[PDB]
Amino acid sequence: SMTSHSWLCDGRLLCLHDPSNKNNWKIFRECWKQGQPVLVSGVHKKLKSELWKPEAFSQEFGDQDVDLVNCRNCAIISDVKVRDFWDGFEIICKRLRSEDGQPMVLKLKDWPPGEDFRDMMPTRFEDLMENLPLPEYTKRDGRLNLASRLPSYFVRPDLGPKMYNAYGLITAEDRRVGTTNLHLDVSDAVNVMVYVGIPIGEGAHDEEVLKTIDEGDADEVTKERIHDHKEKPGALWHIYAAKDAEKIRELLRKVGEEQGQENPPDHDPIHDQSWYLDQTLRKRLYEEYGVQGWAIVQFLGDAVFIPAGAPHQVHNLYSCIKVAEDFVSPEHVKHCFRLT
Ligand SMILES: Fc1ccc(CNCc2ccccc2)cc1
Ligand SMILES: [Cl-]
Numbered sequence: 001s002m003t004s005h006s007w008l009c010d011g012r013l014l015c016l017h018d019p020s021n022k023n024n025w026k027i028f029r030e031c032w033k034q035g036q037p038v039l040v041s042g043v044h045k046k047l048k049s050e051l052w053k054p055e056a057f058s059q060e061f062g063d064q065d066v067d068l069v070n071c072r073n074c075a076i077i078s079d080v081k082v083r084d085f086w087d088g089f090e091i092i093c094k095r096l097r098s099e100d101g102q103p104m105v106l107k108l109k110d111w112p113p114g115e116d117f118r119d120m121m122p123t124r125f126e127d128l129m130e131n132l133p134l135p136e137y138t139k140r141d142g143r144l145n146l147a148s149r150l151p152s153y154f155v156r157p158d159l160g161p162k163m164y165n166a167y168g169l170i171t172a173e174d175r176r177v178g179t180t181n182l183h184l185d186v187s188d189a190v191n192v193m194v195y196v197g198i199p200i201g202e203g204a205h206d207e208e209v210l211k212t213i214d215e216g217d218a219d220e221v222t223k224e225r226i227h228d229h230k231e232k233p234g235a236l237w238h239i240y241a242a243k244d245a246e247k248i249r250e251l252l253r254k255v256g257e258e259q260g261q262e263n264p265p266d267h268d269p270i271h272d273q274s275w276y277l278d279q280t281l282r283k284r285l286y287e288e289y290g291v292q293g294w295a296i297v298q299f300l301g302d303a304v305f306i307p308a309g310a311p312h313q314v315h316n317l318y319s320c321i322k323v324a325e326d327f328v329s330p331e332h333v334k335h336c337f338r339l340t
């Protein structure tokens with residue numbers, strides 16, 4: 001039967017079911033005040049599905065010049081047409097190949113560039129912004145979004161939203177690689193999965209995706225969304241409380257030293273955005289430092305709420321289109337203050 005919400009991560013993660021409900025804030029606000037992430041399902045059912053297809057982005061914008069990243073080795077592929085990314089999103093035999101002859105796993109960098117989403121894509125901007133959950137927090141003019149109301153003593157977010165486009169990771173070796181490495185933001189954010197592409201060519205790739213979710217520490221209810229309801233899983237997240245950020249820096253300074261990096265004792269491995277916590281490192285963080293995170297599978301139409309200051313990483317299971325908006329809630333404004 002239909003319900004307002006459920007508890008994931010064995011009780012530690014709120015999942016809201018009705019993205020537009022006017023009373024969602026009554027359930028959300030205490031979890032948010034405690035510094036927890038929140039998941040909201042069902043946003044895809046509110047959107048115009050024809051605006052969020054890979055083939056439309058290629059047809060409309062394909063002659064723009066862009067840079068890509070090879071997710072396996074961090075190599076930059078400079079100054080290529082954006083159709084060269086989009087046309088291989090779901091069709092493996094169209095993908096750019098590495099020198100070994102394999103199809104690459106690619107991430108589209110900074111596209112649309114800087115703050116240009118609204119100017120380049122006005123109909124997509126309207127469709128996203130009118131359907132964001134918790135609109136008093138997330139809309140540019142929301143009553144609980146302080147972004148437009150703070151003086152220069154606070155770091156203010158850029159004008160959004162921002163699009164995040166990347167292929168899925170495929171192989172056993174790929175399990176230890178990030179799509180987006182461990183980092184933190186000084187603003188809050190909402191990240192919406194607007195499209196999931198499950199390919200054809202090397203099409204029959206189900207088994208390595210189940211092993212990735214299981215070794216990723218996903219809970220038993222999360223496993224039921226696949227097996228029972230056949231929803232499309234897009235990306236595996238790990239998120240850590242803002243209060244645990246320095247203990248994570250201590251672990252990564254120790255591992256950098258073990259691997260023969262030569263780093264000053266104060267250097268910031270989270271700001272460097274150079275690490276992905278694999279199963280080995282996640283277990284060492286728990287056992288050696290006492291730190292537990294949230295392992296979250298973001299399915300089509302899921303919105304992930306990321307608290308300001310919370311370290312987080314993303315690993316795509318299939319090809320993903322995500323759209324994110326930054327905001328400044330009163331609950332977490334301390335994280336963007338420029339003093340003490
Ligand atoms: F405060 C609230 C009271 C009720 C709700 C649930 N509304 C019905 C519904 C359930 C699931 C998906 C879509 C619609 C949500 C919040
Ligand atoms: Cl906080």
Ligand SMILES: [Cl-]
Pocket residue numbers: 120121122123124125
């Ligand atoms: Cl548009």
Ligand SMILES: [Cl-]
Pocket residue numbers: 025133134135136137
């Ligand atoms: Cl709200």
Ligand SMILES: [Cl-]
Pocket residue numbers: 179180181273
């Ligand atoms: Cl990254």
Ligand SMILES: [Mn+2]
Pocket residue numbers: 183184185312
């Ligand atoms: Mn982020």
